[PDB]
UniProtKB/Swiss-Prot annotation:
Glycans are attached at residues 25, 56, 97, 107, 209, 215, 289, 366, 419, 439, 496, 514, 592, 666, 682, 821. The pregnancy serum form is derived from the membrane-bound form by proteolytic processing. It catalyses: Release of an N-terminal amino acid, Cys-|-Xaa-, in which the half-cystine residue is involved in a disulfide loop, notably in oxytocin or vasopressin. Hydrolysis rates on a range of aminoacyl arylamides exceed that for the cystinyl derivative, however. It is found in: Cell membrane. The lineage of its organism: Eukaryota, Metazoa, Chordata, Craniata, Vertebrata. It is a single-pass type II membrane protein. Release of an N-terminal amino acid, cleaves before cysteine, leucine as well as other amino acids. Degrades peptide hormones such as oxytocin, vasopressin and angiotensin III, and plays a role in maintaining homeostasis during pregnancy. May be involved in the inactivation of neuronal peptides in the brain. Cleaves Met-enkephalin and dynorphin. Binds angiotensin IV and may be the angiotensin IV receptor in the brain. GO terms for cellular component: cytoplasm; cytoplasmic vesicle membrane; cytosol; early endosome lumen; extracellular space; lysosomal membrane; membrane; perinuclear region of cytoplasm. Homodimer. Binds tankyrases 1 and 2. This is Leucyl-cystinyl aminopeptidase. Belongs to the peptidase M1 family.
């Protein structure tokens, strides 16, 4: 009978104001409260439709706004999409605003989705408690009934009951703090700005504060009393960023408050609820001693993403979930751009390039769907939060900032903000801004529409003849394609020391570029600022390889890695014989930059770990030796210390793990001593942070070391170190222990159920548990489906890791057979069809190139 039989809410009635009353017992885990909301209808509507999940609706009152009288209004719920309907006695007229107030009883969330409750152990055996809210993917339908759609934005005030010890907090700063009857306080806050449903936030817990307000801007990193001291790099960073993100955007923070919390749990999420920026406990903690540079990078990065959202995604709020990549892809770029401008020493470009590399090798699958995709149901909403969209969008924007000038980019942003600020937009509205900001209204951002509306990335083939280098765009294909406007870039040094670095654009299946001179070596997608792979003719490649042998530094550290990832993935599809890829990396004896080495070790090892599971253990042992032999001089020069560039230290972490995990050199010897020394201390000695994981793994093989380690995981609280140990515990070769850890984590007896994906991933990569990991998933799937969603990131990471190294048709038949028998819904999942595709492609890698490497001896 419910009038709106469409998922998207009615475009008629509209909210203007929001006030909220709530009573959180927490101990009961039950809560009752009142809604207060303002509506100014714009089309005549007898019925009003709003969102509402699971409450006790007691009384229903309508306000005509002509008098102080309220009026009973029969209520109807649909819930399938999740809606409620008010049959107002007085029909509605445009500009005839009315008052929305309702009262509900409800149960606090057992899950970590909505208004939820979680109990935590004190330093003492005190079971203290905490509550909060996370409703980003349309969850605030529950708790306060409302217009969950991010279009219907509004101002928000919220008043809730508390206890005196509990320091309650919310989006807006505090105003009224009365003391009611029963010895219970009712803290209140100011009216929020116009904002969407999901950015709201209520939190009630026992937390201290570290503050350092600046320029009329108050910063506070609330946390549980057990820390309130490890939250200093956050403050030092979160202050410095809010200046930078203020200067670029040329808009100040609207609120006066900025509160960065620390939800004391691990099943949390990092959101950007305005004013109170939720975070997981351990997401922000760091010591200038002890913690690794990678640990420092995550805090200096996860801040920046969540921080910049307060502007982009909070002021400007997407109308629908079509452009969640608009928010995520933007701030993720700001992460690795904010870091480059201020924290340049972190060398965060090495982290950006790797993710873009890993991104492309997942986007080049048929399972990939276009970045912009129609959304009409809840599974389509939640499927849109995949990590690939966040990063592909991060690449496209970088490509645009690479093409159009960087200040042109900045001028484009501010107009995009100010014009459509405090409001809903669409993805096109960002593009329109770029055309206006461009000096010519030419270069319409339709160029972007090429990519946003179609899956996959372009493949660019470059064949050069004299002073004419040609181009031929083509789809990356596995042995549609509706064009790609491609911001091509290139560099040439054809005359001796002649330096040419330019830009172009291809809108056609073919194109050619003129060369001012005859050039000898030429590259494309300079520093890989664009989303494409560049093939060369056989001669054109062979030119570039020689330059790596002579002066490999004429290119950039970014550029070299783009070649090395590009050439290896090509040979894996038979588009180039594999031998030339190793012929390329035969320069690696004279490289001093981390990113060229990191990616090569990834592609080298992938063959090693791939060849091993098939059984050519001899060949892979020979393969790793040659890689060692090239970079051997680099390995011997490394110091087992925590000293150097954060970039430079990253190279130490990788290279050593190579030498030790393949038992190459004295890496084994120099490590085991350390583990023996560290174990002697009851864990009370300095282990260098950068080499800690390698050393833990080198010892765990010994039953003494594994026994020593497992007890330390159950004691200490440095979860970063703790997880670093847990890696090493699963790098043993006693298969018996590996079944225990997995089986333990699944029931979460001495571990926790969350960490299970770390093991099934970890056990699979190393040969001993390769066949063991898949069997745990197969034989324990129903608990993996009872203890997780069927489409969870857990499930996808597990299914990929248990299968991504297979490379026999027999294994592929077993995989597809198992899922198919389980359920048809299980078979059409993204996580499986991707993995089946990987096994097929893995088979082709052998078919295209296995025999030639067997002769490579
Ligand atoms: C956690 O948050 C608390 C919140 O208060 C914060 O407390 C701080 O305490 C200092 C104590 O010195 C406050 O210092 C202020 O000094 C100015 C003048 O320099 C005063 O105006 C302030 O209030 C006084 O004056 C008011 C005049 O209208 C009176 O109405 C009032 O009763 C006071 O007499 C106050 O003395 C400081 O303002 C607060 N707040 C902050 C953000 O510093 C505490 O510091 C925070 N935790 C940490 C670790 O910083
Ligand atoms: C330097 O590189 C530039 C690229 O910026 C390139 O200039 C281009 O040369 C081609 C020559 O083929 C031009 O292409 C023509 O464009 C006109 C535009 O109206 C078309 O009508 C033509 O159509 C057909 O012509 C041929 C048959 O007569 C076909 O073989 C051809 O495939 C077409 O189907 C044709 O496309 C292009 O306009 C220019 N663009 C500019 C900006 O100059 C040039 O090749 C390089 N420099 C030199 C000196 O060659
Ligand atoms: C949720 O409802 C429960 C009742 O079901 C409330 O429990 C009450 O909690 C308060 C403190 O939160 C207790 O008061 C304390 O008593 C001790 C011992 O006398 C005293 O030392 C403390 O200073 C404090 O006064 C109270 O005893 C307890 N109720 C009962 C019957 O024992 C709870 O407060 C409610 N929570 C919220 C957020 O409203
Ligand atoms: C500020 O915001 C306004 C809207 O609030 C922007 O207006 C939009 O401006 C573009 C400029 O080209 C218009 O594009 C044109 O749209 C028509 C209809 O689709 C199309 O036929 C044309 O070819 C062209 O694409 C656009 O329609 C217009 N409105 C909307 C709803 O998109 C304005 O550009 C923003 N910026 C500034 C600096 O004002
Ligand atoms: C890794 O090894 C390469 C090997 O070439 C190093 O390149 C060298 O870099 C230094 C520092 O920039 C250059 O020193 C100066 O270069 C400028 C030209 O940019 C020149 O005008 C100066 O007279 C001086 O030579 C050096 O030239 C350059 N090598 C060559 C052969 O030109 C690179 O710096 C090393 N990186 C690290 C981190 O060690
Ligand atoms: C690398 O470091 C980062 C990067 C990103 C984040 C991040 C996390 C986040 O939470 C989304 C979220 O967890 N669910 C909607 C919950 C959910 C999803 C699916 C199924 N069931 C449930 C309960 N949301 C965001 N943001 N922010 C904006 C403006 C838009 C988005 C998507 N970013 C954290 C840390
Ligand atoms: C709170 O959760 C309970 C849990 O099911 C919801 O349902 C009640 O559940 C209990 C325990 O199983 C049953 O004994 C009752 O018969 C259920 N009914 C009622 C009326 O609560 C309950 O619906 C939830 N609270 C609200 C307000 O929906
Ligand atoms: C909820 O409201 C109903 C309305 O009929 C009332 O009878 C009931 O006592 C309330 N409580 C619960 C727990 O549903
Ligand atoms: C309320 O409605 C009137 C007309 O009745 C309209 O002019 C006004 O803009 C609305 N504003 C508020 C704040 O409710
Ligand atoms: C405060 O703002 C002014 C103007 O933007 C600027 O000169 C100054 O550096 C800012 N200082 C801090 C600490 O934010
Ligand atoms: C460890 O950090 C503390 C706190 O900042 C600092 O005072 C101390 O000097 C550091 N330890 C060493 C050995 O430098
Ligand atoms: C590729 O994926 C699309 C959905 O995006 C699907 O319709 C099609 O059947 C798939 N094709 C292959 C060959 O996997
Ligand atoms: C390993 O130990 C032997 C001890 O004789 C030594 O000769 C060798 O130099 C050591 N390792 C390296 C990397 O040099
Ligand atoms: C070693 O450390 C553990 C964990 O703190 C503790 O239980 C044990 O008593 C310690 N033993 C010695 C000899 O220090
Ligand atoms: Zn985000």
């Amino acid at each position: 009978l419910f009038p709106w039989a469409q998922i998207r809410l009615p475009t008629a009635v509209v909210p203007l104001r929001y006030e909220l009353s709530l009573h959180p017992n927490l101990t009961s885990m039950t809560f009752r409260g009142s809604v207060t909301i303002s509506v100014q209808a714009l089309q005549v509507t007898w019925n009003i439709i709003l969102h509402s999940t699971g409450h006790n609706i007691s009384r229903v009152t309508f306000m005509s706004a002509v008098s102080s009288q309220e009026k009973q209004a029969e209520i109807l719920e649909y819930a399938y999409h999740g809606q409620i309907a008010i049959v107002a006695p007085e029909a509605l007229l445009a500009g005839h605003n009315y008052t929305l107030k309702i009262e509900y009883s409800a149960n606090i969330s057992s899950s970590y989705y909505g208004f939820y409750g979680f109990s935590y152990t004190d330093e003492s055996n005190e079971k203290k408690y905490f509550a909060a809210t996370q409703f980003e993917p349309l969850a605030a339908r529950s708790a306060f009934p409302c217009f969950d759609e991010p279009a219907f934005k509004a101002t928000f005030i919220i008043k809730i009951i508390r206890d005196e010890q509990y320091t309650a907090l919310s989006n807006m700063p505090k105003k009224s703090s009365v003391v009611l009857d029963d010895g219970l306080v009712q803290d209140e806050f100011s009216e929020s700005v116009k904002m969407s449903t999901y950015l709201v936030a209520f939190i009630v817990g026992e937390m201290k504060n570290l503050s350092q307000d600046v320029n009329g801007t108050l910063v506070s990193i609330y946390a549980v009393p057990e820390k309130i001291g490890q939250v200093h790099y956050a403050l030092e960073t979160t202050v410095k960023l809010l200046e930078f993100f203020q200067n670029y955007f040329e808009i100040q923070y609207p609120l006066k408050k900025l509160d960065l919390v620390a939800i004391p749990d691990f099943e949390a999420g990092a959101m950007e609820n305005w004013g109170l920026l939720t975070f997981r406990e351990e997401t922000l903690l760091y010591d200038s001693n002890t913690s690794s540079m990678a640990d420092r990078k995550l805090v200096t990065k996860i801040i920046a993403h969540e921080l910049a959202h307060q502007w982009f995604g909070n002021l400007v709020t997407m109308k629908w979930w079509n452009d969640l990549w608009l928010n995520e892809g933007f701030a993720t770029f700001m992460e690795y751009f904010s870091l480059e401008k201020i924290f340049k020493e972190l060398s965060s470009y090495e982290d950006f390039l790797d993710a873009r590399f890993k991104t492309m090798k997942k986007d080049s699958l048929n399972s990939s769907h276009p970045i912009s995709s129609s959304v009409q149901s809840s599974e389509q909403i939640e499927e849109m939060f995949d990590s690939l969209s966040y990063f592909k969008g991060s690449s496209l924007l970088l490509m645009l900032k690479t093409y159009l000038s960087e200040d042109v980019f900045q001028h484009a942003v501010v107009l995009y903000l100010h014009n459509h600020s405090y409001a809903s937009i669409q993805s096109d509205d960002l593009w329109d801004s770029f055309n206006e900001v461009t000096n010519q209204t030419l270069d319409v951002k339709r160029m972007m529409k090429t990519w946003t509306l179609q899956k996959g990335f372009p493949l660019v083939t470059v064949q050069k003849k004299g002073k004419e280098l040609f181009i031929q765009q083509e789809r990356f294909f596995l042995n549609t394609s509706y064009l790609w406007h491609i911001p091509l870039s290139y560099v040439t040094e054809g005359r001796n020391y002649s330096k040419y670095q330019s830009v172009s654009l291809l809108d056609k299946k073919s194109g050619v570029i003129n060369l001012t001179e005859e050039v000898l070596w030429v590259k494309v997608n300079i520093n890989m600022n664009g989303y494409y792979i560049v093939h060369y003719a056989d001669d054109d490649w062979e030119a570039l390889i020689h330059q790596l042998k002579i002066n490999p530094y004429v290119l950039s550290d970014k550029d070299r890695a783009n070649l090395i990832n590009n050439i290896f993935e090509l040979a894996g599809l038979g588009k180039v014989p594999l031998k030339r890829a190793f012929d390329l990396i035969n320069y690696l004896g004279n490289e001093n930059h981390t990113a060229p080495i990191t990616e090569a070790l990834f592609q080298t090892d992938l063959i090693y770990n791939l060849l091993e599971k098939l059984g050519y253990m001899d060949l892979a042992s020979r393969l790793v030796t040659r890689v060692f032999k090239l970079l051997q001089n680099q390995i011997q020069q490394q110091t087992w210390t925590d000293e150097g560039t954060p970039s430079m230290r990253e190279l130490r972490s990788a290279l050593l793990e190579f030498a030790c995990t393949h038992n190459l050199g004295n890496c084994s010897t120099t490590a085991m001593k350390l583990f023996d020394d560290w174990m002697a201390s009851n864990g009370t000695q300095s282990l260098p942070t950068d080499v800690m994981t390698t050393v833990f793994k080198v010892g765990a093989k010994t039953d003494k070391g594994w026994s020593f380690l497992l007890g330390k995981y159950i004691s200490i609280g440095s979860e970063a170190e703790k997880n670093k140990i847990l890696e090493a515990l699963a790098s043993s070769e006693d298969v018996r222990k590996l079944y225990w850890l997995m089986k333990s984590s699944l029931n979460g007896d001495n571990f926790r159920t969350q960490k299970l994906s770390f093991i099934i991933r970890t056990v699979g990569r190393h040969f001993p548990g390769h066949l063991l990991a898949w069997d745990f998933v197969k034989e324990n799937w129903n608990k993996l489906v009872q203890k997780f969603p069927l489409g969870s990131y857990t499930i996808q990471n597990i299914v990929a890791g248990s299968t991504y190294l297979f490379s026999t048709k027999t294994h592929l038949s077993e995989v597809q057979a198992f899922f198919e028998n389980q359920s048809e819904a299980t078979f059409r999942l993204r996580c499986v069809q991707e993995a089946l595709e990987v096994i097929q492609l893995n088979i082709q890698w052998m078919e295209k190139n296995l025999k030639s490497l067997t002769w490579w001896l």
